[PDB]
């Protein structure tokens, strides 16, 4: 999640920016439904970021395994 986080970052930031004045001019929900839509969206992303984190760091071990194996071959 690279281009996805920034897309989730910029959408949630400008939508949070959007909700500031609509509360201010009252003293809608179409912009609110996208907030929770991106809320449950981006909750997948840092979970998928740590999914990438556990996968990336698992591959670090595996290539450390085969480096010794190749060296043992070597």
């Amino acid at each position: 999640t690279r281009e996805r986080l920034l897309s989730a970052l910029e959408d949630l930031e400008v939508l949070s920016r959007e909700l500031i004045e609509m509360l201010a001019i009252s003293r809608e929900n179409q912009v609110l439904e996208l907030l929770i839509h991106r809320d449950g969206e981006f909750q997948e992303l840092m979970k998928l970021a740590l999914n990438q984190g556990k996968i990336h760091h698992e591959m670090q071990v595996l290539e450390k395994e085969v480096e010794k194996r190749d060296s043992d071959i070597q």
């Binding site: 999640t1 281009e3 930031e13 992303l45 840092m46 970021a49 740590l50 760091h57």
Partner: peptide
Amino acid sequence: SKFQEMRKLISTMPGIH
């Protein structure tokens, strides 16, 4: 929120690289 942005930036090097 910027702290979340920089922790996401830390979480970029696991991902679409």
